[PDB]
């Protein structure tokens, strides 16, 4: 089990040696370091804490600056944890490189979706419209709220609200090419989030 953090750079395509053409998404994973190690004698569970991007000392405060100084490095912008990983490696303060992966591994991508605002029930939940001719006055409405007997409306009655912006993971997603010098990672397919988002890449659970 491995894992790094990176930013979603863009979206493109490459030609394989076979001849076919595949879409890939580019992820840049520079400057991530191991910060803290969580153990079962001290915390109750085993994990590693990784920080991703250096940021100006103007933007960081004393608590987090002391936390990162404990591992002899500069304050980081993104900090996350990885479980199900082997604690024998990951010396505190050591850096994680994209070469932990290799061409052909199957990974998992985790990120926060693009944000859609207050969206209706047809975009949000994929409902069906009513007729838009033949005298109808019912086009993009939710539906019946339920029967009469309960004197109330049940839960999970799907209604309009804020649409996007949740955590999404999509899995069993192959890797294509690793460039160590440019700290990039070409991985085949889509990942959630807008450009410049944070993407958490780790070995497939299954």
């Amino acid at each position: 089990t491995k894992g790094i953090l990176g930013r979603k750079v863009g979206m493109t395509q490459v030609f394989t040696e076979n001849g076919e053409l595949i879409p890939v998404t580019v992820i840049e994973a520079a400057q991530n370091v191991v910060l803290q190690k969580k153990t079962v004698e001290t915390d109750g569970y085993e994990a590693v804490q990784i920080g991703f991007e250096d940021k100006r000392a103007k933007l960081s405060n004393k608590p987090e600056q002391g936390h990162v100084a404990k591992a002899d490095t500069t304050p980081k912008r993104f900090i996350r944890e990885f479980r199900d990983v082997n604690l024998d490696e990951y010396e505190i303060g050591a850096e994680v490189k994209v070469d932990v992966f290799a061409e052909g591994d199957i990974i998992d991508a985790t990120g926060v979706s693009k944000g859609k605002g207050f969206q209706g029930v047809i975009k949000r939940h994929g409902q069906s419209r009513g007729p838009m001719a033949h005298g109808s006055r019912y086009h993009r409405r939710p539906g019946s709220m339920g029967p009469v007997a309960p004197n109330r409306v049940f839960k999970n009655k799907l209604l309009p609200g804020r649409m996007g912006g949740e955590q999404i993971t999509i899995q069993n997603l192959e890797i294509v090419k690793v460039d160590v010098e440019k700290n990039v990672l070409l991985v085949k397919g889509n990942v959630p989030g807008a450009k410049k988002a944070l993407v958490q890449i780790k070995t497939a659970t299954k």
């Binding site: 395509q13 001849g19 076919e20 053409l21």
Partner: protein, 122 residues
């Protein structure tokens, strides 16, 4: 993208001229057939003195479409009309000649006789 009520020209030597599609085979809620897909259909127009008569229920294979297919190498093909070839219970045509170009995807579906008879397999 050909569904029920779609009406396509037939491109072989049998008596038919024009065909309306009844049902797209290959699933329960299936709603679309494309190149290389067998479809049940009826004859809306025939040439006089042909083998296949008007108002007859037959099955046939789609041979070219205005929205064609994409290939693994990233290339596409598109024709100008939707064409059809009436076939038997197995994959052998009921005519003797085939008119116009024919898409390559028929070879991978094991429609070998039609590919043999076609004047061009693009």
């Amino acid at each position: 993208m050909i569904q029920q009520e779609s009406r396509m020209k037939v491109a072989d030597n049998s008596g038919a001229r024009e065909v309306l599609t009844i049902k797209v085979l290959g699933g329960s809620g299936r709603k679309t057939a494309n190149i290389g897909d067998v479809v049940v259909c009826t004859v809306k127009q025939a040439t006089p003195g042909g083998v296949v008569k008007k108002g007859e229920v037959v099955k046939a294979v789609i041979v070219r479409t205005k929205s064609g297919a994409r290939r693994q190498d990233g290339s596409y093909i598109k024709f100008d009309e939707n064409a059809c070839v009436i076939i038997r219970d197995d994959k052998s045509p009921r005519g003797t000649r085939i008119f116009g170009p024919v898409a390559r995807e028929l070879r991978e579906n094991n429609f070998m006789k039609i590919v043999s008879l076609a004047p061009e397999v693009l």
